[PDB]
A paper describes a structure:
The [name] ATPase polymerizes on single-stranded DNA to form nucleoprotein filaments (NPFs) that are critical intermediates in the reaction of homologous recombination. ATP binding maintains the NPF in a competent conformation for strand pairing and exchange. Once strand exchange is completed, ATP hydrolysis licenses the filament for disassembly.
To determine whether the second metal ion is present in a [name] filament containing dsDNA, which is thought to represent the post-synaptic state of the filament after completion of strand-exchange, we examined the 2.9 Å [name] structure of human [name] bound to dsDNA and ATP in the same [name]+ buffer (STAR Methods). To capture a bona fide post-synaptic filament state, we incubated [name] with ssDNA and a dsDNA that contained a central mismatched region with perfect complementarity for the ssDNA (see STAR Methods). The structure of the post-synaptic NPF was highly similar to that of the pre-synaptic NPF, in agreement with what has been previously reported. The higher resolution of the post-synaptic structure confirmed the gamma phosphate of ATP, the carbonyl groups of A293, S296, and the side-chain carboxylate of D316 of the adjacent [name] molecule as the coordinating oxygen atoms. This apparent tetrahedral coordination is likely to be completed with water molecules to give more common bipyramidal coordination, which would also be the favored coordination of a physiological Mg2+ ion.
Author numbering:
A (entry chain F), B (entry chain E), C (entry chain D), D (entry chain C), E (entry chain B), F (entry chain A): 21 to 274, 283 to 339
Write the structure that this text describes.
DNA sequence: TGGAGGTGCATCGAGCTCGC
DNA sequence: GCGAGCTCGATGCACCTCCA
């Protein structure tokens, strides 16, 4: 997919400058074409004279102009949709989780956010014709609730070898919000060498709830969170992966809305509101989407991952 | 297990700065690697220049990058599971109370929350092959309901010398929520010198119900509680201990949910709902877990701690 | 026992600030050590700068850190247990009413709640070797059912001079729930000058049943009751007295549970359920306790207080 | 006895505010001292600032602190006990009906509840040395069964002038439960101008049996009844009158208990169970009391009120 | 006597609201003054704002406060007592059947309950000086045992024109318990236009014995019966009529008590127990009364109604 | 006479609901007007909303309000009285057996109860001017003692064609008490199509003596019997038939009273006590009646039914 | 530049004779 | 001249701030 940053050295850029770009987090020509002038001036060995030269060269390698809605409609027909393991959720999402966008799943506790992320971490490795993305999975966990035993159960359901499923899931544990963002720079490096199909941040806001406390730190909290969601969108456009983040809820005391404020509400393309039903059954509702009508669907958390209820 | 903070003085940090870290609550290199930039700037003799130097040095001592799910699945096979004294609860928990996570036990009065905490305080000292954790226990009591006589009864059941069992249980009585948190900083110091296997906070929310009263203080209450649960998670990752907190219930008037709100619901990895059965028998239900199916099991409070019912 | 608050003026606190503490209800160094930052900021002439200075000084006078369960087991062997006048209840309670905790006695009418409180008000003045507490008694009555003639009958049974027994029983009549709480601040002042062994609130919930009426006031009712039970626990830790509260019942229409809800159920360390037997005989059952098995015992209300049945 | 509310205008309260208190039912300084903050905020022209000022001023006029059981034992020796006309009932009650408390008389029909209330309405006017209370009587009838002809017969027995006996009995007929409570506010006004010794509510629960019907209204019924019994206790503490209420029975179908539930059982200090004997003779039994042993006594309904049986 | 409800429209109530009251069964100002807030909220076009306005206006038209027993003794001297046709029963009842109260007559079959009700239905039309009530009679029959031929025989005895006696007896046949109560609302309407002196319900409990069968319906039976007896008491206070109800007996198998339970025993002011003597002679006994001693009297059922025995 | 239930479909009721009423036993508008709300809720396809609509519509078709005793005296002059075949019994009953009421005939064996029922079954078919009812007869026999040969003998006495007399007597044999009641629902259906004048239940209590045995089943026995007698009264008001039931006797061992207890004694309007005289002559005595004096009369059982004795 | 759930209450209603 | 036991049903209640 994306073009390696080494193509800039052929097009008239010194390899010493390309090295300076890679240490700033740019491992692809697209990542440079998508960056403003500011993000290149901040690098040490890069001046404004080298910036326009770098951007001009990257601009003719990546198409960054106007195009017809007809052409864009053809490219969106080839977008992959990853099955959620539930036949009912796939009808609600009209195919499954969409790559190249940020999908947010929120709900109270035990609503299935970590279980959907575990099912997706396996179903993203299925062939395209089986509803997968035919790529690896990367799981950034911020709570310590990542259980490879759940992956092995989903892998048994689809007849995949559990040993190979675990080998194609990159796992990282974030311990603060700075580490959570620093993990994304390493994610860009890994998405260049091997093909990934899914990026999970579970949860994307849990650490923001305590690294920044009180209204006095509310602004800096939302600024840092907004930068985090921008690099996620960047990873989605750069590598065409599906970004699935998990969010937490808060009570309205004045009946539960997701945390993160307006930053995460605007940034998330699709938002899924998970609520508990009866027993193991749970209800997902389209809370926000550009193309999906507001509807509900009922799924279940079985011993083999997310699936459909028995009745 | 965890590496002492003194290893930073070898790696290029002034011992005067390490002293300043230890007075802020950092007694391990992991505790520094897991902390953001903010928590280090707040210390007096630490500037931003020393912060990145401190974090960079701690970052190469602790692995804080990506890894395969296969490697993580091997480390989770070595996790210890502490027996609850009941053969039925151990099947429900598929082994017992899991270290490195926060387990919440809630229920109405006399449901056995303090009795399970007393049984765990002894069974955490058993050898690994007997279902224990082979370490000391630390009991933070916020109600005054800690009874060493119950420990001696559990110790007689497992053939341990009651005099040595009491010597391996550190006990503290918290009197307010500020003291409850201040006790955790002393807990980190004690977990460095000797090996602990279990940390009990009974109850973790009782003092929040009255130190903060009314909706006008609801936000500050949940903020303080959220910070408390973060340092608990920190103690679990730093020292690999099992954190077992106890929670209280409230009636729904509109049939009893645990207090603490969404903060403690999201933070708790496993939640056990204890309800009363017949006589001395009581029923535990998996209320939340990443890997455990929602099921019930019946245990009993006998004269020798928590065990199985006679029938 | 407890250290007078005047010891803070020696340790570096201005006597004008100590005066401001005493008008807020703090008459002992322990009462200040046990209080959070919030309760000190609310006092007028106390700022945050004086708060940490006050708390730091009080923290080195009162041990508020960790200790071994062995040391705590020695201190609990010296705890006093006050005889209930009945040889059968003392076996059920394994000694009698325990000091330093809150014991709740509930039941329907005429079940003996006021009679046990009258027997305890005398037996708390016996020497330790006779089953007493060797201290005064304080009786907060909220119904007007305090009868010194019953004290004189219990005093004749134990050979005490009735004139001195009545002189060692402080009596107050509470008329509303605000007065009931305001009476506890005067109780702390009186527990400093002379040694008390027992504090009776009969009944602790009767006035809450009518000062707050309906579900619309249910929250404020339980908040006020919870604050009341916290200052009771404070009086028990500060002065090591036995707190014996009396509770009322309500019918389950859907066969009688105590009122007060989950607030008083969690707060009470020991709960005794009194029910009527035959004639003058009545049955007490351990309804909740950290160390006592659920069992029953039969006592009697004779002409000389609570005692054992004739058969 | 009680101090008029006009004493507050001398102590620093505006007479316009005192007027606002009197229209809320407060005609005595004691009635204000005994009221919580809530009952004063509900009055229109009273804010929280005026509330504490009103309560603080009333608090130094009425002793509302601790006292010795010795002092309380002296005040209870001066309590008046009103003769019931029967020499046998006076031995059972150890003197007669006690002022300052609520006495409940219940039984099936024709058991003598209305006849005892008629005898008491006359004997409460006797001099103290003859067993009376030396005050007027107030009779709140809720059934229409008040017969002044019975008062004239009791008056002839004690040699009192029947014309003056009827002049010292205030009579009111209540038609619903709201009217029954509204009558107590007028009772407080009348107890200030002239001295009363007895307040009769016959029957206190008859109208509750039909103004509130079914389990769906059971809660509101018991709430309203509980408020009624609180204002009765208030009238007993404020004016030191004897409150004698009459209650009805219900069959246990599963052998007759009084109606009203646990509300009236806890609130009543003394409960007398009247049952029919032979002919005109009837049996009273102490059903509940703080100081009276459970015993029985036989009385008779003669042509001159309640008296002793011929044999 | 009673004031028409139209007087409220003069005192500041909209005639549309008065119309809404009349369709709820309120045809008199007294009927509104005697009703609680609840009974007015249940009407459709009546809100709480209109309720207090309606009750306040009705409260100053009807005296509903305290009064002296002397004044009440004068009003009870003017109460009418209706002759029972028997000189012996009138001495037993000290005048006859008393208006403004509920008199219950019970006994086994053929004991004369329907015959006394037929004699009363005529004697209530006699002038006052002849022992009557000088008003019409209303006879609610629930058995079909109403015989105008018996009225004509009683009318011949007192020299009244039988054609006019039958014109002054309103007759209704009730077929179920709902119809029995619905008939009382029409009774209130008829008591406003013309003056009535007597209301007969024969029998008041016969239909309750079969519309509600078994213990499973016992509660609803007694609730419905209690509401019926309340509207009877209301008709007695509103219109000053004599309410004479008839009751049935049941055998004690463990020697015959009246049915209806404690509801009808408490509600009935006077209860007459009729038993069979010799031949046509029968014995009435005062079974319950506020002012009448328990005594017996012998009457007879002759060809001209209830009278005295020949010997 | 009675209006068919089909008139409700014209007045605004769905014919599907009318069908549901007819399967519950309601075949006439009167039967619905006479039923309470409860009896309509028990039907499946009938809700409370349809109940009031059904009852309101039936209420304006049947007059169910008050009326004058004069009007009721005219309707009772048109009541039919069926001759008993004996000139002496007709003078005792002042005309004969009265329609629209329940007449009970009891006595020991061979006293003529079954013979009077056979004579009535024929004389009820005579023209009105001959002392009959001009309608059919329905005979519910519970013993097997129905003999059409006795009807033919009575038919010969009155000159009726025996073949037509037997065609106008509907006969049913009841085998248990449930069947005895189930037969009455079919009786209501048959009374709608053709006009009946008499309903005989011989005997109404014989099967109750053995379907329910012992005191343990006494309550359920009397409940079932009471329901049976209510549907009989319903058939009498609905169709204006004469209900003649037969009862059995029991010895008083402590000289023979009828069985059935107080249920059948109250329910029966008229009770005839038959005793044996000399030879074929027997004596009937008015045992209970609203309008008939207690007197005796002598009749005879001849070869042609019940008649007068020869002397 | 959004953030944070809390808290139980209230009992009622009697019915049904049988067997020399 | 004396001994005999069994029977269940029902429901509705609201209010509470503060945060750099
Ligand atoms: N093997 C299993 N079989 C069935 N159900 C399971 C299994 N493992 C976990 N569950 C259930 O999955 C549910 C959802 O848990 P999950 O980890 O998805 O919660 P969550 O939404 O991430 O919550 P939180 O906010 O606490 O992190 C839990 O209720 C748990 O009982
Ligand atoms: N003058 C009198 N002489 C003797 N006995 C009388 C006299 N007046 C009333 N009694 C008796 O007093 C008894 C008790 O009646 P009372 O009014 O006290 O009943 P009660 O307990 O209030 O009943 P209820 O629940 O029906 O109101 C009755 O049995 C009545 O016969
Ligand atoms: N004209 C009359 N002359 C004499 N006695 C008569 C006359 N009419 C009726 N009686 C008698 O009146 C008595 C009482 O009958 P009544 O109708 O009053 O009974 P009851 O108490 O209502 O009975 P039940 O419970 O059956 O309805 C009967 O015994 C009857 O014989
Ligand atoms: N054809 C007849 N001629 C004369 N007498 C007859 C004739 N048939 C029957 N009897 C007499 O009629 C009398 C009454 O019998 P019946 O059937 O009426 O009794 P019963 O009261 O129903 O008795 P049981 O309680 O036994 O059923 C009997 O004594 C019988 O001898
Ligand atoms: Ca999770
Ligand atoms: Ca506990
Ligand atoms: Ca959780
Ligand atoms: Ca008490
Ligand atoms: Ca407790
Ligand atoms: Ca009475
Ligand atoms: Ca009481
Ligand atoms: Ca009758
Ligand atoms: Ca009565
Ligand atoms: Ca026979
Ligand atoms: Ca027969
Ligand atoms: Ca009858």
């Amino acid at each position: 997919g994306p073009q390696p940053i080494s193509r800039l050295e052929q097009c008239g850029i010194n390899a010493n400058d390309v090295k300076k770009l890679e240490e700033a987090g740019f491992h692809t020509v697209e990542a440079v074409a998508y960056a403003p002038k500011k993000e290149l001036i901040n690098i040490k060995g890069i001046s404004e004279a080298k910036a326009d030269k770098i951007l001009a060269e990257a601009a003719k390698l990546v198409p960054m102009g106007f195009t017809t809605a007809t052409e864009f409609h053809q490219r969106r027909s080839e977008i992959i949709q990853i099955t959620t393991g539930s036949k009912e959720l796939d009808k609600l999402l009209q195919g499954g989780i969409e790559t190249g966008s940020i999908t947010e799943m929120f709900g109270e506790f035990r609503t299935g956010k970590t279980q959907i992320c575990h099912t997706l971490a396996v179903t993203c490795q299925l062939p395209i014709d089986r509803g997968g993305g035919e790529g690896k999975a990367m799981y950034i966990d911020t709570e310590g609730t990542f259980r490879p035993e759940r992956l092995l159960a989903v892998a048994e359901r689809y007849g995949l070898s559990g040993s190979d499923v675990l080998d194609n899931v990159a796992y990282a544990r974030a311990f603060n919000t700075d580490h959570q963002t620093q993990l994304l720079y390493q994610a860009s490096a890994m998405m260049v060498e091997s093909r990934y199909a899914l990026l999970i941040v579970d949860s994307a806001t849990a650490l923001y709830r305590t690294d920044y406390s009180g209204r006095g730190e509310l602004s800096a909290r939302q600024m840092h969170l907004a930068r985090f969601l921008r690099m996620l969108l960047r990873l989605a456009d750069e590598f065409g992966v599906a970004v699935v983040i998990t969010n937490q809820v808060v009570a309205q005391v004045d009946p539960k809305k997701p945390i993160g404020g307006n930053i995460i509400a605007h940034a998330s393309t699709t938002r899924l509101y998970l609520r508990k039903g009866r027993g193991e059954t749970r209800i997902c509702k389209i809370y926000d989407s550009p193309c999906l009508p507001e509807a509900e669907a009922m799924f279940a958390i079985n011993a083999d991952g997310v699936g459909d209820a028995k009745d």
